[PDB]
Design a protein around this ligand. Structure first.
Ligand SMILES: [Zn+2]
Length: 336
């Protein structure tokens, strides 16, 4: 069968990549892409994390992440929190055998700037969704700058795993819940409106046809599927999972039941680096989470390079690394 991007007008390369990703779990090996966060653009983003991984394992992550939005910064104009300078490295990463991933630590447009983890009321959230308000104009200014950056990658036909508004069932980011594991039906509705607003702006208003859309609740909070905006707006579902016990992560059954490819969209140890063993994570994928198509481990103290088991993680028969998705200039054969 053919699995199509939810954007019917997706570029051919993006169509090909999405279909290829969806078929990975049919294989007997070479079926989970490795991934690493590279950092926040013009703050911590660099090739240093990829280099640490290559030093540790001889291989580079198949997926490399950048985050455009430095939402903790107070700035003269809120959109100054957006920086897209990591694009050059992302485009090179695609040219050299990997796939870029972009997330957004969005500044909070209920405020003049910054405040990304300052919670807001439903009344404030409604103002943000209203393009006529001061708050709504701030959101749109951020979206426009983000789209400008994404457009640079689209010009070169570079497919992007785009993962906006993540961990929305968590109580830390402004776009998520306001209290720990507290259901708020209005907040859920407003989140879906916000996701669709971003989807519509990027896909339709700006015609961005190189995006694969990733929905990523937190593994350690309830309501993992309640926030799902719908099958027509999401390509890949996944868990952001920070844990000690790889075998006890919640949410895999709930998300795979949505009949979308599944990934560990973020992964890392919950407690201080050094002792956590990534060998247990890849084994847990094989035993508990076999539909996993990729993992994206965080950098800094969460990196496999500063924990145990990087070699086992990267050299497992199931793992696919940078360059290994290709047979020359075509992707490796799909298995049905
Ligand atoms: Zn098929």
């Amino acid at each position: 069968h053919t699995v199509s991007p939810v954007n019917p007008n997706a570029q051919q390369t993006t169509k090909t990549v999405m279909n290829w990703l969806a078929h990975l779990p049919n294989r007997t090996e070479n079926r989970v892409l490795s991934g690493a966060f590279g950092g926040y653009s013009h703050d911590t983003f660099s090739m240093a994390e990829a280099d640490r991984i290559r030093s540790a394992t001889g291989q580079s992550p198949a997926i490399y992440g950048c985050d455009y939005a430095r939402g903790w910064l107070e700035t003269a104009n809120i959109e100054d929190s957006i920086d897209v300078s990591c694009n050059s490295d992302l485009m090179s990463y695609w040219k050299n055998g990997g796939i870029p991933q972009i997330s957004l630590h969005l500044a909070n447009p209920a405020f003049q700037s910054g405040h990304f983890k300052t919670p807001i009321t439903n009344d404030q959230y409604k103002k943000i969704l209203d393009s006529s308000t001061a708050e709504g104009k701030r959101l749109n200014a951020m979206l426009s700058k983000i789209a400008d950056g994404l457009q640079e990658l689209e010009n070169q036909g570079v497919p992007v795993l785009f993962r906006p508004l993540h961990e929305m069932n968590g109580e830390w980011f402004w776009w998520g819940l306001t209290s720990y594991n507290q259901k708020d039906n209005e907040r859920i509705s407003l989140y879906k409106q916000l996701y669709k607003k971003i989807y519509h702006y990027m896909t339709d208003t700006r015609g961005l046809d190189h995006l694969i859309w990733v929905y990523s609740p937190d593994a350690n909070r309830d309501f993992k599927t309640d926030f799902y905006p719908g099958a027509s707006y999401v390509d890949i579902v996944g868990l952001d999972a920070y844990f000690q016990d790889a075998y006890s992560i919640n949410g895999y059954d709930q998300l795979t039941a949505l009949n979308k490819p599944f990934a560990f969209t973020e992964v890392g140890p919950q407690t201080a680096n050094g002792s956590f063993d990534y060998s247990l994570f890849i084994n847990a994928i094989k035993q508990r989470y076999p539909k996993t198509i990729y993992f994206l481990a965080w950098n800094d103290e969460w990196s496999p390079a500063v924990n145990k088991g990087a070699s086992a993680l990267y050299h497992d028969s199931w793992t696919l690394n940078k360059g290994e998705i290709w047979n020359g200039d075509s992707l490796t054969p799909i298995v049905e």
